[PDB]
């Protein structure tokens, strides 16, 4: 109990804090200075008594035979974990920022505590969600401006715990709350940026926070430029390290489900596509059966103006794209494909002339095809994939002499 | 169903990320959007039906 007296933390305390992993036969799990008359001291001495119990109830949890019902058993742990973290909240309200990562260790193993329960009809995540919410607010408003104790360094690590919760059962407003609350906070400088937060001491959460942010921005709010930015950064801070047993990326799993969103988001916003032989791209795309064929043909369809191959690629993996929150990205990326093909009848069919007949594009009822074509081009002009103007009279498009077919870069 | 929240290792050094290695690594994003030409059955057959249009419409 010198951790709490002299405000430091070691593996053993986090190892003690880890109630799921059983400890060795030699046991050093105790609080010294037992006098607990002070009201705030038996908080530390029932924090103790709850910590001993939970680690005991985890050999208890699998030692059982087939009984059939462990509801009370899982409810004994959830309640113990709820009131223990609720009491770590009381202690960590009034101590330095030494104790935030031990508070976060406690919070993420309570998320796995409810995660193993498969049924969501119990809605027992509300307790921990509220628990984590106050746990996210303990650090969110540290009114000590000194950075020796300021808990706002751990702000962003605690945001990823709540993101995980607001995704369990799909809730896109709760995710929308926390992206926007946090945004103003370092715009107002009340918290330090993610690159100067406690996050860069445990960089799993650095990659994760840019995923949740980029994902929310790309799949839920439809801000593609910023959903790309954060997702791209989440991949750029993943380690260049590999498991030796298999030789594939440590973090291969995380790296690939970022790129499910990153590749199509990169092509819509910035017109960027991967170098396939590049170590990081190749290391992930080639070893992912899902991405090995769709995404390379997906890129080729767009670069080449191949609308059929894009539309077939998208029709054949519609369930995949819908499940990944990619439908607007795909539906909008299709109009990039259409404009590239428009660029291709300019380069190869009009000899780069600013005035182009619309009947060139029919070669790939006819009044109706041309009206529809005028309207699809008009929409692309209007959203900045073509800088041109239309003539219904001549049935032609008049590309700008300056910078037609623009794109962000 | 499947959890990517459980990272296998919690932290690593900054020099081990891909952006700090991006001085020695090449850009992962090809930037030739404006000038990249691809050869496949489709591009070839598109040029075909297009040079046939400019012959029809000199």
């Amino acid at each position: 109990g010198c951790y709490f007296e002299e405000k430091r933390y070691d593996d053993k305390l986090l190892d003690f804090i880890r109630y799921d992993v059983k400890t060795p036969k030699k046991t050093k799990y105790i609080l010294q200075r037992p006098t607990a008359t002070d009201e705030e001291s038996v908080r530390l001495q029932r924090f103790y008594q709850l910590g001993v119990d939970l680690k005991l109830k985890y050999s208890k949890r699998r030692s059982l035979k087939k009984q059939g019902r462990i509801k009370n058993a899982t409810e004994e742990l959830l309640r113990l974990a709820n009131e223990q973290l609720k009491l770590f909240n009381r202690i960590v309200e009034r101590e330095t920022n030494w104790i935030i990562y031990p508070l976060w260790v406690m919070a993420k193993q309570l998320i796995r505590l409810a995660n193993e329960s498969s049924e969501l009809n119990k809605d027992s995540i509300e307790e921990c969600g509220r628990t984590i919410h106050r746990s996210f607010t303990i650090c969110l408003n540290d009114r000590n401006p000194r950075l020796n104790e300021n808990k706002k360094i751990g702000c962003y690590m605690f945001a990823n715990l709540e993101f995980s919760i607001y995704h369990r059962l799909s809730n896109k407003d709760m995710i929308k709350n926390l992206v926007k609350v946090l945004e103003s906070r370092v715009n107002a400088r009340d918290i330090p940026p993610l690159n100067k937060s406690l996050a860069m001491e445990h960089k799993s959460q650095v990659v994760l926070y840019n995923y949740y942010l980029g994902q929310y921005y790309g799949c839920l709010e439809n801000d593609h430029e910023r959903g790309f930015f954060h997702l791209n950064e989440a991949l750029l801070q993943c380690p260049m390290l590999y498991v030796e047993s298999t030789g594939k990326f440590v973090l291969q799993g995380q790296m690939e489900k970022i790129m499910i969103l990153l590749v199509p988001l990169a092509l819509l916003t910035k017109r960027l596509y991967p170098h396939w032989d590049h170590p990081v791209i190749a290391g992930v795309i080639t070893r992912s059966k899902r991405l090995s064929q769709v995404y390379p043909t997906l890129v080729r369809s767009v670069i080449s103006g191949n609308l059929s191959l894009y539309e077939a690629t998208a029709a054949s993996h519609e369930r995949f794209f819908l499940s990944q929150g990619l439908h607007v990205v795909i539906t909008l990326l299709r109009e990039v494909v259409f404009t590239r093909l428009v660029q291709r009848c300019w380069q190869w069919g009009n000899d780069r002339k600013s005035i182009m007949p619309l009947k060139i594009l029919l070669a790939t009822d006819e009044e109706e095809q041309l009206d529809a074509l005028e309207c699809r081009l008009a929409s692309a002009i209007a959203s900045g994939l073509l800088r041109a103007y239309l003539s219904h009279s001549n049935r032609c498009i008049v590309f700008s002499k300056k910078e037609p077919f623009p794109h962000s870069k | 169903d499947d959890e990517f929240e459980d990272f296998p290792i919690d932290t690593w050094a900054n020099g081990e990320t891909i952006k700090s290695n991006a001085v020695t690594q090449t850009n992962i994003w090809e930037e030739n959007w404006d000038d990249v030409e691809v050869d496949d059955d489709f591009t070839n057959e598109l040029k075909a039906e297009l040079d046939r249009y400019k012959r029809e419409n000199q």
């Binding site: 799949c219 439809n222 607007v328 539906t331 299709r334 529809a372 699809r376 | -």
Partner: protein, 272 residues
């Protein structure tokens, strides 16, 4: 055990339930059924205020919720107020009803009457709310549930297709496909059709420098040119309707009405 009511008085007004329910004031389903028919007469005969039918329908909805009746009659009451509410612009009560209908379709005991009709409303309301994730989550529900008869229903396909058409500003097919909509779908689109027309008008005016006034009239389904010019007057664009006389290559002498869409660009970029 569920509460069960004895009230034999057909009519009941809606009040937000605050106390423990009074079984003398709550009506059993046979009486709720008898009042459904009275309400339906008034509606078909157009002899009741919508405010009145809506009050009666909410009271009938409240009495079902506390009696925990989830059956084919419950579905009918919610489905009927949904339809009537859309006919009277009450999108708030439509949404209240649409949500309850969808959760009641999760009950296997309750047969899916008009399941595809209300799937179509769910998509149209998510277009009004600019909620595209909901649209995608629902197509995914139909796919994972095995509902391929619904998904390849031509009308259902068109209504998802409309959602996409609006996402990418295709006014040409969105407005053509307005004519394919059923009676109450039209009612739902009209809740935001004015703004959508304005969004379409901005796309045309950013992309042409002038167009016939007949071309605007046709692409926006204005049934007359008088309804075409009044739409432009609502956007303060009446002065950009110029007149230009056409030689028609010595075919005939005639004058047509042009719209200077380049001049309209100045005015429409001020509002958005």
């Amino acid at each position: 055990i569920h509460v069960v009511g004895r009230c034999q008085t057909l009519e009941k007004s809606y009040l937000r339930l605050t106390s423990e329910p009074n079984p003398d004031l709550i009506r059993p389903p046979n009486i709720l059924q008898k009042m459904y028919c009275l309400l339906m007469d008034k509606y078909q005969s157009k002899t009741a205020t919508y405010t009145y039918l809506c009050d009666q329908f909410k009271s009938m909805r409240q009495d079902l919720r506390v009696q925990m009746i989830e059956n084919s009659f419950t579905i009918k009451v919610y489905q009927t107020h949904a339809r009537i509410a859309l006919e009277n612009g009450d999108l708030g009560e439509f949404n209240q009803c649409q949500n309850r209908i969808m959760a009641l379709f999760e009950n296997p005991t309750i047969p899916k009457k008009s399941y595809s009709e209300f799937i179509c409303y769910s998509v149209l309301y998510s277009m009004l709310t600019e909620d595209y994730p909901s649209i995608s989550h629902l197509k995914l529900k139909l796919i994972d549930d095995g509902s391929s008869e619904i998904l390849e229903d031509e009308h259902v396909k068109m209504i998802f297709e409309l959602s996409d058409m609006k996402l990418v500003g295709n006014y040409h097919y969105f407005m053509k496909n307005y004519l394919k909509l059923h009676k109450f779908e039209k009612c739902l689109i009209n809740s935001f059709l004015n703004l959508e027309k304005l969004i379409f008008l901005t796309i045309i005016c950013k992309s042409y420098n002038q167009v016939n006034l007949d071309f605007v009239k046709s692409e926006f389904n204005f049934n007359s040119i008088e309804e075409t010019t009044n739409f432009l007057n609502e956007q303060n664009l009446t002065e950009f309707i110029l007149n230009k006389q056409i030689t028609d290559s010595n075919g005939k002498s005639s004058n047509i009405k042009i719209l200077n869409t380049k001049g309209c660009r100045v005015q429409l970029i001020q509002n958005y």
